[PDB]
Symmetry: D2
Amino acid sequence: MELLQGKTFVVMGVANQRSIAWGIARSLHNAGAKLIFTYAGERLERNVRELADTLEGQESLVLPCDVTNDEELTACFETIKQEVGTIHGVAHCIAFANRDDLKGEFVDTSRDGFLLAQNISAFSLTAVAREAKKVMTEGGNILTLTYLGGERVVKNYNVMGVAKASLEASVKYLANDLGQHGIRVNAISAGPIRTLDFNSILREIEERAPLRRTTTQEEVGDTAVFLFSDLARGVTGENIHVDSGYHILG
Amino acid sequence: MELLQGKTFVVMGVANQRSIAWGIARSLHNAGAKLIFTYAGERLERNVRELADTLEGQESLVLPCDVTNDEELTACFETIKQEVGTIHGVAHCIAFANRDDLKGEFVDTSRDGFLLAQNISAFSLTAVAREAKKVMTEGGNILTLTYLGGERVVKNYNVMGVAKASLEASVKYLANDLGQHGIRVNAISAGPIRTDFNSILREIEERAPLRRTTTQEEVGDTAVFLFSDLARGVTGENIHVDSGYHILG
Amino acid sequence: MELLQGKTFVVMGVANQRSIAWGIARSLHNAGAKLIFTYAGERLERNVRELADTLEGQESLVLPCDVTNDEELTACFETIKQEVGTIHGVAHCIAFANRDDLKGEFVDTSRDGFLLAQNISAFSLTAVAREAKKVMTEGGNILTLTYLGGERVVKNYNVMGVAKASLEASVKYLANDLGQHGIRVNAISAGPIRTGDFNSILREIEERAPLRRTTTQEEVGDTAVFLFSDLARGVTGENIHVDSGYHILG
Amino acid sequence: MELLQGKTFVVMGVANQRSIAWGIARSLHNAGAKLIFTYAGERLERNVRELADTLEGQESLVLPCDVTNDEELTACFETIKQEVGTIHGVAHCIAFANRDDLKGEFVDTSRDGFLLAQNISAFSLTAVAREAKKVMTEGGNILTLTYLGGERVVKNYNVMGVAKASLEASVKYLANDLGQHGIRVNAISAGPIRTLDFNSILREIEERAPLRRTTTQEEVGDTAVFLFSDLARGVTGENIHVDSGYHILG
Ligand SMILES: NC(=O)c1ccc[n+]([C@@H]2O[C@H](COP(=O)([O-])OP(=O)(O)OC[C@H]3O[C@@H](n4cnc5c(N)ncnc54)[C@H](O)[C@@H]3O)[C@@H](O)[C@H]2O)c1
Ligand SMILES: NC(=O)c1ccc[n+]([C@@H]2O[C@H](COP(=O)([O-])OP(=O)(O)OC[C@H]3O[C@@H](n4cnc5c(N)ncnc54)[C@H](O)[C@@H]3O)[C@@H](O)[C@H]2O)c1
Ligand SMILES: NC(=O)c1ccc[n+]([C@@H]2O[C@H](COP(=O)([O-])OP(=O)(O)OC[C@H]3O[C@@H](n4cnc5c(N)ncnc54)[C@H](O)[C@@H]3O)[C@@H](O)[C@H]2O)c1
Ligand SMILES: NC(=O)c1ccc[n+]([C@@H]2O[C@H](COP(=O)([O-])OP(=O)(O)OC[C@H]3O[C@@H](n4cnc5c(N)ncnc54)[C@H](O)[C@@H]3O)[C@@H](O)[C@H]2O)c1
C-alpha cells in the first residue's frame, strides 16, 4: 500500500460510483497516490466532486475537461501544470457511441455516429497524451480501457468495437512515440462488470470463463496500480486482459 | 481464365495505372469478369474512363463516387442497380491521410486529420457495403486492402496505421452482419510494392521469406480467388500478400 | 479448371471417402493436377488404392509412408524422385492424439500421449518438408490443415490444441526457411465438417457463424487449389480460415 | 514490500546468478515471499543452494526435481506439501533444446531433438501444474516464461520457437482447467537480456524498442510479483510482454 507514494495521477472519466475510473481511483489512492480528477460536463461535476471528497487526506483538484474540445483540454493541463508541476500518469477512461448505432446492425452505422465514437473513444487518447507529455517530465504510464469487442466480434458492440480497435492501435503507436521520453502506454481490456439482455451475458461469463466469475472494478483498479508503478517499467504497448480469462476462449 | 466468367464487380479507387485498384482490375478482367469503375473527383474522371475503356469498352460503366458524399454514394449504386441490376462484389481500394500527419509523430496527429483518415479509409468500407448489399442479390464478396501497419507499428505509417486497424475491425463486424445474406467480406494485406521508400523495399528483399517485394499482380490474383466461388467458405479473413514478411519477429 | 495443369502433388492422409485429404484430392484433380497418394499403414492400402483408381486420367502412384518412421519417409520420397522426377507440392493432412487424452482435462494429459500427438500432428510437417524440398526443384507450396483450437481454447480439443499450436508455429518457421528455395508453406484452418457431442457443435456453428452454415470438404479443397496455384505465389506463412467466418467471433 | 507477505512460492529453473528465475526469486523475496527451489542436475545443486542460502528471513528448501522424471516430480511436490503444507504459486523457468537443432535450419530439426524440446520446455508446465494443484489449496498463480519467438519467427530460435508456441497454448488450456480451482496460469514474454552474435541483437533492441533499452531480470521479476499477487486476481491465460515494447513493432 505504498507503491505509488509521492506520485500524482490524473483520472479521467469518473461519472459515478460504479465507473471503472472510480475503481481505478480507489486502487491508486490505496496505493498512496495523489489524484486529480476531470469531469466531462457540468452535469457530472457534483458526482465527481462528491466521490473525490470521500478520499482521506488532501482534497483533490476536480476540473472540467471535454476531450473533444482542444482549447479546454489544453487549459485543463496548463492548470494541472500550474497547480502540481509534475504528474506521473493518466488514466484515460473515456468512451461514447450513440445508442442507435449500437442497437442496429453495424453496416447501418451512421457516418456522424462513427466519427463521434472515433473522436471521443479513440482520438481522445492521443489528444490527452499530447498534453500529458507536457507535465510527465519524469516519465510514467498512460492507461486506457478497452474491451474484447475491439479484437473480435461481440454482439451489439458494433461501432464501439471498431473504435476500440482504433484505440488499441493508438496505444501501440503512442507507445512507440513516447517511450523515448520515459512514458509507457498500456491498455486494460476489462471483462463485463455486473454493476455496469446484459444479464444473460454475465451468466455466460460466470459459466464459461476460466475463473467462473465476472470482473470487478477493483480487479481492474488493482491491475492499473501495477501498470502505473515501477513494477511495470519494462511494460509498454501492452493490452492486459482483466476478464477472468474469457479472452482465451474459442 | 474463366473463374469470374459471368460476374460483375465494382472497382473503387483507381486513380492511374499504378493504383493497386488497377492491378486488381486487370487480374479480374483476365479472369473473365465484367467491371464497373468509380472515380473520386472530376480530376480523375478522364484517367478512369480511359483506363476502363482499354479493358471493357467505350460502353463501360464509369461513375462518380466520392465516398465522403452520402448522396453521390447512394446515387452511384442506384445507377448501378438501374443499368446492370445485380453485381457480385466490390473491390474497395480507398485510403487517405494528410501528408502532414504522416510526416510528424503519431502523438502530434491533428484531430481533423485523424477523423479525415478514419472517414475516407475506414468508414467508407461500411458506407459502400451498405449500398452494395442492395445490388448483391446473389451474394458475393466485398474486398478491401490493408497493410501490416494496421496490426503492428510501422515507421511513418502513424495515422494510417490506426485507420487500417479501424478498417480491419470493420471487415470483421461487416462479415458478421452480411454473411447471412450470402455476402463475404475480406481483406488483403499487401506488402510494399515498387510500382525513404527504397530502403524499405531493400529490407523486404533481404528479410522476407520469399526474398522479393510484392507486385500488383500477386495482389490481383489473390483478389481473383477471394471474389471466386473457390473462396465461398472464407469470410472475415485477412490474407497477407507480402512475401511472408508478416511472420517475422 | 486448369489452374494446376502440368503440376503434380503428393497427398498425405487419405484414409477413406470423407477424409479431408480426399476432398482436397478431388479439388486438385478437378483443377488439372496429377496426384501421388501415401497410406499410413497396410490396413489403409486398399482404401487409398481404390479411391485413387476412381480418378480419370493416368494411373496414380500409391506409396506406403508412415511419418513416424524416417527410413520409410526417406524411401517414399526417394521413390517419388526416381519415378516422377519433380513435384510441385504436398498436402499434409495428418494428425493423431490418444482418445483417453482428448477425453480428460488437459492438465491430466499423459506425457507419452502429449509427445505422440506432437510427433505425428506437428513434427511430421517438418519431416515431410525436409524430404519434399529435395523433389520440389521448381518451388511450389506445402499445405497443412489446422483448427481454431490451435489458437484459442476449444472444448475437448485439449492435447490436439497444443499440437496444432506447434504445427502453426512450424508453418511459420518452415516458410522462413524454404522461401528462398521458392517453396511456400501455408495452412488452412478448417471449421468442423458434418461428414463428445459433435452435432451440437455443428448446430452452434450454423446458428452463430457469419455464413450460418458448417464447412464442407469441397470448400477446403478449393482453398487448397488456390494455395497450390500460382495465384498464391505471394502468399506464404499464412493460415486461411475456411470456417464460415467463425474465427472472428468473440 | 509486503505484497506477498505470508506467501510461499516454488521457483524452478535457477541455474546461476544470471538466470531469469533468480531475478524472479529476488523480486518475490523483496515482496515478502518465502521461496522453495528445485534443481535439475547435481551439477546445479551447488549453485542453487548457494543462492537460496543468501535469502534472509528463511531457511532453505532446495530439492532435486528432474521434470522429465514423473516419479521424482511427484515425490518432490509431496515433500513440499509435507514441509510447508500450502504453496501459493510456481515459477516455471525451464527450457532446453539441443545446440545442433538451434544452429541448423529449422527444417533440419531432428525428431528426437524436437520431442526433447517439447518434453522439457512445454509439457513440463503441465506436469508441474498437475502436481502443483495438489498443494495450492488456497489457489494462486502458475507462471511460465516465453519469448517473442513463440509467436513470430526469430532468427535461430527455430525448434525453441515451436516449443514456446506449444508452451503458450498450454498456458491457455491449463488456465481454462485450473481457474475453477482458484488457480491462475500466465506467461511473461521476456525480451533479450544483456547477461543472457548476441550483441547486435541487443544493439538493435536498444535502437528500435519503444523504451530504447534491453530488458533486465529485475523487470521480469517485478512483473512476476504482480502476477503472483492478489493484484492480478482477475488475470489468467495471459501473456505479458516484458520486452521494452519490442513486440508491437512490425
Ligand atoms: N463497462 C464495461 O463493461 C467496459 C468494459 C471494457 C472497457 N470499458 C471502458 O471503460 C471506460 C469507462 O467506461 P465505464 O464502463 O466505466 O462507464 P462510464 O459511463 O462510467 O465512463 C465513461 C466516461 O466517459 C466520459 N466522457 C464521455 N464523453 C466525454 C467527453 N466528450 N469528454 C470527456 N469525457 C467524456 C463520461 O463523462 C464518463 O465518465 C470506457 O473507455 C469503456 O469503453 C468498459
Ligand atoms: N501503397 C501501398 O504500399 C499499400 C500497401 C497495402 C495496402 N495499400 C492500400 O491500397 C489502397 C490503394 O492505394 P494505392 O497504393 O493503390 O494508391 P492510390 O493513391 O492510387 O489509391 C488510393 C485511392 O483512394 C481514392 N480516394 C481518395 N479519397 C477518396 C474519396 N474521397 N472518395 C473516393 N475515393 C477516394 C483515390 O481515388 C485513389 O485511387 C489503399 O487502401 C491503401 O491503403 C497500399
Ligand atoms: N476433422 C476436422 O474437423 C478438422 C478440422 C480442422 C483441421 N483438421 C485436420 O485435417 C487433417 C485431416 O484429418 P481428417 O479430419 O480429414 O481425418 P482423417 O482421419 O481422415 O485424416 C488424418 C490422417 O492421419 C493419418 N495418420 C495418422 N497417423 C499417421 C502416421 N503415423 N503416419 C502417417 N499418417 C498418419 C491417417 O492415415 C489419416 O488419414 C488433420 O490434420 C486434422 O487435424 C480437421
Ligand atoms: N534467455 C532469454 O533471453 C529468455 C527470454 C525469454 C524467455 N526465456 C525463458 O526463461 C526461462 C529461463 O531461462 P534463462 O534464460 O534464465 O536460462 P537458464 O539456463 O538460467 O534456465 C533454464 C533452466 O532449465 C532447467 N532445466 C533444464 N532441464 C531440466 C530438467 N530436465 N528438469 C528440471 N529443470 C530443467 C535448468 O536447470 C535451468 O535452470 C526459460 O524457460 C527460457 O526459455 C529466456
